[model samples]
Target: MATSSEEVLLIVKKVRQKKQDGALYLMAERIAWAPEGKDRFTISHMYADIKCQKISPEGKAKIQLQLVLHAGDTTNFHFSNESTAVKERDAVKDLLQQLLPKFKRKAN
Candidate 1:
């Protein structure tokens, strides 16, 4: 499910990208998403390449997380685990918040 050198910190099931369900992987150096039952990732973003992440507003019915990249691309992931969707999403956010800053570099 992951490269030998990549240490996977967490895996959240029932995540959706464009309405298709899959799993979300949070690793020591990157965040990846793969389709259900897939061995490889369909989407991957290195921490250094991501500018920020956002979550859907609380009033909205959908539980989603979005990653904004340095190149201006954004990916939205929907959490569909009915019992623990918000908690799972928040977990990802907090981890990203902690991880992202380590990649920051001075413009040079």
Candidate 2:
């Protein structure tokens, strides 16, 4: 029953955790071709793609986090980063922690 924004936040958190643990993979493409040196590329950027959906009982939405990477001779490439669900959970946790204080104030 989570919103799209919430899902996106979760994804971000997971990516951050993987990054902290040095477990995330980065890849790059060259001229529309996946090169052999894809693994050598680093994560150049990351972001979220929030989309509204009416598929859940609570009107829950789906959020997609698009992880972008830059490698040699390539500016931005679509890298098959991490698992979507795992990333979503982590990102949500991270965002909720940051907003806890604000939420608490609103609750009162």
- Could you say which candidate leads in TM-score? 1
TM-score of each prediction = 0.70, 0.20
lDDT, candidates in the order shown: 0.69, 0.27
Worst 10 residues of 1 by lDDT: 99-108
Off by over 4 Å in 1: 1-4, 57-62, 105-108
Candidate 1 TM-score versus the reference = 0.70
> Where's the lowest-lDDT run of ten residues in candidate 2?
48-57
**lDDT computed for candidate 2:** 0.27
Assess the local accuracy of residue 18 in candidate 2 as a C-alpha lDDT between 0 and 100: 18
What are the C-alpha RMSDs, in order, of all predicted structures?
4.5, 14.4
Q: Supply the TM-score for candidate 2.
A: 0.20
